Write a protein that binds this ligand. Structure first.
Ligand SMILES: COc1cc(Nc2ccnc3cc(C#N)ccc23)cc(OC)c1OC
Ligand code: NA
Ligand code: NA
Length: 369
């Protein structure tokens, strides 16, 4: 009834679990853990700052906010202001969180099993593995720099600059952004939500097929909408992957076949990419190909697509159906599906044929060249 309380002790691992799971009470549990004011004591955060930035770290700042704005899976964000006035956000890891992951995961699963809340061991290792990748804040900083360079001059999106002097293996600092995360934007008007989600799906297509450099686990909590500028700050860099153009090219042939309602080509190309073995049980394979074709439905229609009902987690969870499998077996579906799910959670509606034809057209222009 109040597993929430004991889960708040491992709220980081529970959050990561909920982002993978997307019984009904368990969602309410996770939603309450997420919405909990329970945060890691300041004293533990100070140890990371001292270890990483030196005992004099506070001298670099005029202000350090002791209550975090929000907690991540392995750290929390504290707002602050540098000497001179430059406002920043400082994402700070829990001390030795890397060595606490296995215990935190075991604790989370124990609480969920003993409470009879969870009716797969290999997926638990996926949880451990994903939390460990999140610990690499040096890499995350490098991905933020590269995305900022790729999106230079965009009229809608921006990436806050990294503050190198406040970055370390366990601390990532950016300039402050003015706005709020998209998990608080459900109450915005339909036109605004449509415009946000349109731009997000276009960027998804550019990340996959143009940049070959992409965030593969989209989370609406990591996009910030600035209502005044009418812009979105991108802070979602945790699972960023670069792929060879030959790999995303095969993926665009899948989406092309799904848009064209060519179920057999979707299946053949899926086998070629090693997403399917070719001898899966047909019932599961069919449900998986059904979810792909839902993606094609959107990209095949000049009429507005109703993400709120047509691409809900119910209709698209088979994009990735239940030793863990290689990440390259599902990262692109997780990206496409995750982007559709953001459109669905914000109840967006807009036509998608134009944006896919532009992406596919660029693909064809290069193919002839
Ligand atoms: C999701 O990932 C991150 C999120 C943040 N959050 C923020 C950044 C910049 N301004 C903010 C303003 C407010 C306000 N009011 C709240 C949060 C902000 C910071 C990060 O790094 C330092 C992240 O890690 C890449
Ligand atoms: Na984290
Ligand atoms: Na840059």
């Amino acid at each position: 009834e109040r597993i929430v309380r004991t889960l708040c002790k491992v709220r980081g691992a529970a959050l990561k679990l909920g982002q993978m799971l997307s019984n009904p009470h368990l969602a309410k549990i996770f939603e309450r853990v997420r919405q909990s004011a329970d945060f890691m004591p300041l004293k533990q955060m100070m140890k990371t700052l001292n270890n990483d930035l030196g005992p004099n770290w506070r001298d670099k700042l005029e202000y350090f906010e002791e209550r975090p704005f929000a907690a991540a899976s392995i750290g929390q964000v504290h707002l602050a202001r540098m000497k001179g006035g430059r406002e920043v956000a400082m994402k700070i890891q829990y001390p030795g969180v890397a060595q606490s992951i296995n215990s935190d995961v075991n604790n989370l699963m124990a609480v969920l099993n003993m409470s009879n809340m969870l009716p797969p061991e290999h997926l638990i290792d996926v949880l451990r593995r994903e939390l460990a990748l999140e610990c690499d804040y040096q890499r995350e900083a490098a991905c933020a720099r590269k995305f900022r360079d790729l999106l230079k001059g965009h009229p809608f999106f921006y990436v806050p600059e990294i503050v190198d002097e406040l970055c370390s293996p366990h601390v990532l600092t950016t300039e402050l952004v003015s706005g709020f995360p998209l998990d608080q934007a459900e109450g915005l008007s339909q036109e605004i939500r449509n415009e946000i989600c349109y731009n997000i799906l276009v960027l998804c297509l550019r990340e996959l097929f143009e940049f070959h450099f992409m965030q593969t686990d989209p989370n609406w909590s990591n996009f910030f909408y600035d209502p005044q500028q009418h812009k979105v700050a991108l802070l979602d860099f945790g699972a960023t992957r670069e792929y060879d153009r030959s790999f995303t090219d095969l993926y665009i042939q899948i989406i092309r076949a799904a848009a064209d309602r060519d179920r057999e080509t979707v299946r053949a190309k899926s086998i070629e990419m090693k997403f399917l073995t070719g001898y899966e049980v047909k019932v599961m394979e069919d449900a998986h190909l059904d979810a792909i074709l839902i993606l094609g439905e959107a990209f095949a229609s000049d009429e507005p697509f109703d993400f709120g009902t047509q691409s809900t987690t119910e209709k698209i969870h088979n994009l990735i159906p239940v030793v863990p499998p290689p990440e390259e077996t599902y990262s692109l579906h997780r990206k496409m599906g995750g982007s559709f799910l953001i459109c669905s959670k914000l109840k967006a509606r807009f036509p998608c044929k134009a944006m896919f034809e532009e992406a596919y057209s660029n693909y064809c222009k290069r193919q002839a060249q």
